[PDB]
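Example S7 (structure tokens).
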């Protein structure tokens, strides 16, 4: 797996941007996050059927991409997905259903993209030792699934900012709720790409409020994971830095890909990237924690491959060229 990646979400559905068959996806994407595995009534058995092709056709298309060095990952959740693991029985249905899908289609890994049903209960105060069943069981399930496959099994996640960087402000309910998940699976985590969009403002480690879709915001939010940060206003409760090679930034491919804002122009984003990766500043207000950069910063994720194709391939062309050209 390359050192500077483009990870793109792939719509297993037509939302007006159309379907792109797998072999027609631009080769500039290194990893394709197939979107999404969702659930029915029991909210724990994950299901997936391809939007085009026989099952065998879809599996063959995945095999073709893998033969070209690409990774194809099953994303679980999304805007509409609901996964609830209140007890061990539910956890086991989740594990078995996902393993079955990985086996059936030959997915290279899984992406945790759960955007509901995740809360730190009252008294759940320690990110190293979570107590809320949903969180404890997700961690257990993720570790179990990862340990069911070989060394190249890919694990990613795409939490919204409140769940991660929001932990700088509060630790409870959704605030910081992915922190125990991240920590609990860190030794199996390939990378995390927080969604830096549909996100309003975010507080940086300088205590300043930043607006989504600005270079300063991208640097401030990424730096939290690159450097680590105190949780919930408690100086003695530090969330440790991830490896730089585990940190990505998730961005909208086009303005319309994130209807509540967050899109950033490649010109502005390259300022943020040069600062993050090389410590080369751009006159921004945010001061990077390590002023000579985090060279192993892993790259960019986008919602989505489909949106990118409808927007002159702006995201894929701009950022592939940027990363290739370093
Ligand atoms: C990274 C990620 O998965 N983001 C979430 C997406 O699911 C969401 O896109 C929306 O997904 C729905 C299915 O879950 C689609 O029905 C819907 O059309 C789609 N919205 C758009 C504008 O493409 C994106 C939207 O920015 O953010 C998260 O909510």
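Recovered sequence:
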């Amino acid at each position: 797996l390359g050192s500077k990646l483009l990870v793109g979400y792939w719509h297993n559905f037509d939302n007006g941007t159309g379907i792109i068959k797998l072999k027609d996806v631009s080769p500039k994407w290194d990893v394709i996050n197939v979107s999404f595995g969702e659930t029915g009534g029991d909210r724990s058995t994950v299901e997936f059927s391809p939007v085009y092709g026989t099952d065998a056709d879809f599996k063959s298309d995945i095999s073709y991409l893998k033969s070209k060095g690409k990774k194809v990952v099953l994303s679980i959740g999304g805007q509409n997905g609901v996964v609830l693991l209140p007890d061990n029985a539910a956890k086991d249905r989740f594990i078995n259903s996902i393993q079955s899908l990985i086996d059936k289609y030959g997915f290279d890994g899984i992406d945790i993209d759960l955007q509901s049903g995740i809360y730190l209960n009252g008294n759940d105060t320690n990110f190293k030792n979570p107590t809320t069943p949903q969180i404890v069981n997700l961690i257990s399930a993720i570790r179990t699934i990862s340990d069911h496959y070989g060394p190249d099994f890919l694990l990613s996640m795409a939490p919204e900012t409140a769940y991660v960087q929001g932990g700088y402000s509060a630790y409870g309910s959704i605030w910081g709720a992915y922190l125990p998940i991240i920590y609990g699976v860190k030794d199996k985590l390939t990378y995390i790409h927080v969604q830096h969009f549909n996100a309003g403002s975010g507080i940086g480690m300088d205590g300043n409020n930043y607006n989504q879709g600005t270079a300063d915001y991208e640097v401030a939010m990424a730096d939290m994971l690159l450097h680590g940060f105190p949780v919930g206003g408690n100086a003695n409760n530090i969330f440790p830095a991830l490896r730089s090679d585990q940190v990505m930034i998730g961005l909208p491919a086009a303005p319309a890909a994130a209807p509540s804002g967050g899109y950033i122009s490649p010109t502005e984003m390259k300022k943020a990237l040069n600062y993050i990766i090389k410590g080369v500043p751009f006159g921004g207000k945010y001061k990077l924690s390590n002023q000579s950069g985090y060279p192993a910063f892993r790259g960019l994720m986008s919602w989505s491959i489909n949106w990118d194709a409808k927007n002159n391939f702006e995201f894929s062309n701009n950022y592939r060229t940027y990363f290739d050209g370093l």
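Notes on this example. The first helix runs from residue 55 to 67.
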